Amino acid sequence: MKMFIGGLSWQTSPDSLRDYFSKFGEIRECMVMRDPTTKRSRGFGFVTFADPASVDKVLGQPHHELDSKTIDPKVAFPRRAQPK
Amino acid sequence: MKMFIGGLSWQTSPDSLRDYFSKFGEIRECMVMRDPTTKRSRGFGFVTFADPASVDKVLGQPHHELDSKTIDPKVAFPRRAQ
């Protein structure tokens, strides 16, 4: 159970994203990538918390911002394929 | 390094995404999730190939279609926090 964060500033590093979301609980993994769907320089990120309670705290807080962008964290539930 | 596929049909399963891209090369990992940025139903996908050469073959093909949707795979380079 991950959180997906779209619309990140190009200046947002994975450490920056980690630092923001660690205020809500223990982070198991935090990754950013440049969003390849636009030439506008922006990123998206995925945050994995150790405790699902942390997701509720994020979703409950009505305003989030990071590196001059208003962000809107969403839940994401990846489904992996088996080997062929 | 992964390929990002936006705009998947809601019907596209992980296995279908895997079977489509396996035509271009060996797969390390393949996942699908609901795109949480729309109220209607669509997916996005992430495919990790064993060999980057497979990415070139995907990028070079002019038209891709999966479960009746045009898809336009892009390259992505995830960076993890320390």
Numbering used by the authors:
A (entry chain A): 1 to 84
B (entry chain B): 1 to 82
What do the authors of the reporting publication say about this deposited model?
RNA-binding proteins (RBPs) play critical roles in cell homeostasis by controlling gene expression post-transcriptionally. MSI2 is the dominant family member in the blood and is expressed in 70% of AML patients. It correlates with a poor clinical prognosis in multiple hematological malignancies.
We obtained a high-resolution crystal structure of the MSI2 RRM1 which allowed us to utilize a newly developed computational molecular modeling algorithm and perform docking analysis. We performed docking analysis to identify a putative binding region. Based on Ro’s ability to compete for MSI-RNA complexes, we hypothesized that the binding site is likely to be shared with the RNA binding site. Thus, we predicted a stacking interaction with F66 and R100 with Ro. Also, the K22 side chain and the NH backbone group from F97 formed stabilizing H-bonds with the oxygens from the aldehyde in the C2 position in the pyrimidine ring and the aldehyde from the opposite ring. To directly test our docking model, we mutated the putative interacting residues (K22A, F66A, F97A and R100A) and determined their ability to bind to Ro. This resulted in significantly reduced binding (F97A KD 69.5 ± 14.7 μM, R100A KD 148 ± 65 μM, F66A and K22A KD > 200 μM compared with 10.5 ± 0.3 μM for WT). Importantly, the single mutations did not disrupt RNA binding to MSI2 whereas the triple mutant completely inhibited its activity (KD > 50 μM). To provide additional evidence for the docking model, we performed NMR chemical shift analysis of 15N-labeled RRM1 and observed three main regions with structural changes by titrating MSI2 with Ro: (1) K22 region (with M21, I25, G26 and W30 shifts), (2) F66 region (with S61, G65, F66, and V67 shifts) and (3) F97 region (showing V95, A96, F97, and R100 shifts).
